[PDB]
Design a protein around this nucleic acid. Structure first.
Length: 135
RNA sequence: GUUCUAUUUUGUUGGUUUUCGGAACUGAGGCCAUGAUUAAGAGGGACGGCCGGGGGCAUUCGUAUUGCGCCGCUAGAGGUG
């Protein structure tokens, strides 16, 4: 865990894969390739209740903890990719999405580029549920 | 022109042919003001340039979903009021 890049010259870059459903929130720091990961802490592992894993509070303290983990090993800037559930299911990012990148930016972690990588189907299969929906 | 035929007539007695009245057939005529309403804000059809998620056959693309292979890191992951 020794970054040979000089801190004062230019900024070491990384990315976290922000996936935030309506029942859980995932923060997943990987490298610029994405094959190799550095840190991955979830919203559900700091709160011991199933109903508030996606809550905006359970998201926020996960944000500095990954950032604290990403600080000694030498990364100051992260790229951000938002991810919702995608597929045939809902496309809106959960309530833990916005609190994730906000608190890490407040923690002293720089921001790279912003884009959304929701797995948007061109033309999907049958949506789960009946013809009348979730009655 | 052809065929048969009512016949009036051959003075009467007898055959015949026709003028003659009828019926039918065949060829050359003359004449018609020589014979054709319209093209329906009806229809049918032809033609010209289009037009269209119309139909059938073949071909091609796009994520996403599922499953699998490999790599990385992990204690939770799904789901719900």
């Amino acid at each position: 865990s020794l970054g040979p890049q000089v801190a004062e010259g230019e900024n070491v870059f990384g990315v976290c894969h922000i996936f935030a459903s309506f029942n859980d929130t995932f923060v997943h720091v990987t490298d610029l390739s994405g094959k190799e990961t550095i840190c991955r802490v979830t919203g559900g592992m700091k709160v011991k209740a199933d109903r508030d894993e996606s809550s905006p509070y359970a998201a926020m303290l996960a944000a500095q903890d990954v950032a604290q983990r990403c600080k000694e090993l030498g990364i100051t800037a992260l790229h951000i990719k938002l991810r919702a559930t995608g597929g045939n299911r809902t496309k809106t990012p959960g309530p833990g999405a916005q609190s994730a990148l906000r608190a890490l930016a407040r923690s002293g972690m720089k921001i790279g580029r912003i884009e959304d990588v929701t797995p948007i189907p061109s033309d999907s299969t049958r949506r789960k549920g009946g013809r009348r929906g979730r009655r």
